[PDB]
Design a binder for this molecule. Structure first.
Ligand SMILES: [Mg+2]
Length: 301
């Protein structure tokens, strides 16, 4: 009733008091966005886009030199990583062409809402912008059955930069403005690379068209062109990390804020770039499951 609004006001007061403590939002906020888990969404991609078979894509990537037979350990390691993600056939398997957008549309959302209004549909647009691999023209990614799990992409241990647009729609098919809703940019690993290639792999979010809220104590810092990443290893204590990757980078760790930053939405069309260097495989989840401590849910009406 108002029991809630009182608890909301109390938690917000505590959040301002504990601003500077590890894991708290540096600026207190509440959460109006509920976009947490959608395991039974319907995924649709336009017939113009080729959704690859497992063997088909395997042969194609091998044809580019990313093969288990390649004498260059970088390329055979690139393959090994690629094979692991290509083995999950619940993903839609895509080859992105540079500057050619691809929409992945999720419908029949069951669990999601913004400020009491049901979210029925979310559309992701993926556009490869740059890659260090071969002639810079193509790269593989994998679109999840669940829009909150979202995507894996590759860089074949070079680098990749993919723009993502996100648009959410209500029951009436209208574009929703989720301004003020909070999104989780999580698991932004640095230093978790292949020791055979380069441990200093870097996962980042670039060109975010919202406003980041730094999490106090987090390894993830903001940089020019609204780009969030760590400045040194958050993977190994022996290279300065507070925790080894396995101690913080899970959905269940109380330390998982250590590799995270919060994004506050400011536009109906959300935009950011997923970017990696020397990572092989990158899991990029986009959801409202913020890792920060003491963020109350904003009550409705
Ligand atoms: Mg990660």
């Amino acid at each position: 009733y108002k029991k809630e609004f009182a608890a909301y006001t109390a938690a917000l007061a505590e959040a301002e008091s504990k601003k500077k403590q590890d894991g708290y939002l540096s600026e207190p906020r509440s959460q109006s966005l509920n976009f947490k888990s959608e395991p039974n969404a319907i995924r649709t991609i336009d017939s113009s886009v080729h959704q690859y078979g497992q063997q088909e894509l395997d042969a194609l990537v091998k044809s580019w030199g990313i093969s288990p037979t390649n004498p260059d350990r970088k390329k055979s390691t690139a393959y090994s990583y690629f094979n692991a993600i290509n083995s999950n056939n619940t993903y839609a398997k895509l080859v992105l062409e540079k500057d050619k957008p691809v929409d992945v549309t999720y419908t029949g959302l069951k669990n999601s809402s913004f400020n009491g209004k049901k979210i029925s549909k979310v559309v992701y647009t993926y556009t490869l912008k740059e890659t260090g691999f071969n002639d810079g023209t193509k790269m593989t990614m994998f679109a999840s059955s669940d829009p909150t799990v979202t995507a894996w992409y590759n860089d074949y241990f070079t680098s990749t930069n993919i723009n993502v647009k996100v648009k959410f729609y209500d029951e009436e098919g209208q574009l929703m403005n989720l301004t003020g809703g909070l999104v989780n940019f999580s698991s932004l690993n640095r230093g978790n690379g292949s020791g055979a290639i380069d441990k200093d792999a870097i996962e980042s979010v670039r060109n975010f068209n919202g406003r980041y809220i730094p999490i106090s104590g987090s390894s993830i810092k903001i940089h020019e062109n609204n780009s969030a990443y760590a400045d040194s290893s958050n993977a190994e204590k022996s290279l300065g990390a507070r925790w080894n990757t396995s101690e913080w980078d899970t959905t269940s760790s109380p330390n998982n804020w250590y590799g995270a930053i919060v994004g506050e939405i400011t536009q109906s069309e959300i935009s950011f770039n997923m970017a990696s260097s020397k990572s092989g495989n990158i899991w990029f989840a986009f959801n409202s499951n913020i890792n920060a401590i003491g963020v109350p849910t904003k009550p409705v009406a």
